[PDB]
């Protein structure tokens, strides 16, 4: 297959504005949200129809209970962080866990935390240790690494469980996740050449400009891959024209095993 991933995020906010939840958790397969939970609804709910259709209510009930537990834990952990930073006001705490199943069959696995949107602790499941960015993190690292069984538990979950769940959801959503919609690609002038692609899925795409068959690097402006709203994506790349000497410019697009070249006459 193509590379696929599963990841769960948590956000905790210490002093949120009125109505804004103090805790939010979203899961993703690739770029698709699959699940959502927050401290207002207190319910774990599907965000993809192919998840809803394939997981019975007992599943949503179980993980709703677990997320209520994880919500309280996140609040405790953020309270401890902001106390040790000696910080006033509202501050944020974030977690991301997940795994990837690569094309060639290899796997990756990751788990890390952030405070105020900056790396705080990063798990190394090979050395079985936590990387701390500062002395507040260092205090937490000592406590977490004193519990060797918990490090072993996360290594096993990242390498075995997460991958088994990913394969299960990938099957659930195969019509969505494993389809291919090739890009529609065009060139126009605006003085720079703009190469534009749209209507493609998956979002991973490589566009670039070549000058006389050589790849210009620090001369190409790269647009972001952007959601179009209907489930497909669009992107662009531009290159500035030299008015003093002719050149053969060509736009190059790679998408899901197919290469395309548009020569500008």
């Amino acid at each position: 297959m193509r590379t696929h991933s599963l990841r769960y995020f948590r956000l905790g906010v210490s002093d949120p504005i009125h109505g804004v939840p103090e805790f939010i958790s979203v899961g993703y397969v690739d770029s698709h949200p699959i699940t959502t939970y927050d401290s207002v609804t207190r319910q774990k709910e599907p965000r993809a129809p192919w998840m809803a259709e394939n997981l019975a209510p007992d599943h949503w009930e179980r993980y709703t209970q677990l997320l209520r537990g994880w919500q309280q834990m996140f609040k405790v952990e953020l309270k401890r962080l902001q106390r040790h930073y000696n910080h006033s006001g509202s501050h944020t705490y974030q977690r991301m866990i997940g795994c990837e199943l690569l094309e060639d069959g290899s796997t990756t696995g990751f788990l890390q935390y952030a405070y105020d949107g900056q790396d705080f602790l990063i798990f190394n499941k090979d050395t079985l240790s936590w990387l701390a960015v500062d002395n507040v993190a260092h205090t937490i690292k000592q406590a977490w690494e004193a519990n060797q069984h918990e490090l072993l538990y996360q290594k096993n979950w990242l390498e075995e469980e997460c991958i088994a769940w990913l394969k299960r959801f990938l099957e659930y959503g195969k019509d969505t996740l494993q389809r291919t919609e090739p890009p529609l690609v065009r060139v126009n002038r605006k003085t720079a050449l703009f190469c534009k692609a749209h209507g493609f899925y998956p979002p991973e795409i490589y566009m670039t400009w070549m000058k006389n068959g050589e790849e210009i690097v620090q001369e190409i402006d790269y647009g972001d891959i952007l959601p179009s709203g209907d489930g497909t994506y669009q992107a662009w790349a531009s290159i500035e024209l030299d008015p003093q000497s002719s050149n053969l410019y060509s736009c190059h697009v790679e998408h899901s095993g197919v290469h395309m070249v548009l020569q500008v006459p």
Epitope: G69, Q72, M73, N156
Partner: antibody, heavy 108, light 116 residues
Amino acid sequence: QNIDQPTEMTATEGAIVQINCTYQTSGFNGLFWYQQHAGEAPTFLSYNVLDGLEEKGRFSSFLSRSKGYSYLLLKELQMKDSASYLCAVKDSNYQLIWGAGTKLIIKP
Amino acid sequence: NAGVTQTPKFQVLKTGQSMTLQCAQDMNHNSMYWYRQDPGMGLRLIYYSASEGTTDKGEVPNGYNVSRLNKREFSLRLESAAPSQTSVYFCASSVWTGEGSGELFFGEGSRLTVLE
């Protein structure tokens, strides 16, 4: 999903006993052993989640994830080791499945 | 530092009688559990409480209900006792739940016998 362990084992004071636990689960988040003396609460003995052998006093616990198998090994048995030994596996939804317990009888 | 305290140790009941089992933990744990233990089978979960303020059914909830009264206390209610509810009931607690390696801490057990 099932977890199985022998009902009863009898060994001699001073010897070594290996209590087996096999499990069939969709997923795996760890295997626990608990000790329960007759009429008393279970108390935690050991946790394994990766493959191999872990020592803790006269007790060691072994795990093979690929075989779905664990044993609790008791060396130099004493009369106070007479008790039931409960194996439990945490499954893909973090729910415990409990084996029915092995009663260990020790001959003085 | 008493651990998990559950009461009563023993109770005889007539079919159709009500009964509440009490359980408290002073370990500042977040997750509590009620189990029944019967001859020839593994512990079976009745109800559990992942955190203060939430509870849900276990494997064998029928005939029972629970109240997570506060962080410390998790009571088990038999509203109309039945002979099949003759068992040994165990309350347990854990620091968190769904956490992987954390072990359970058990109360002493409550032995109920329900008679016609």
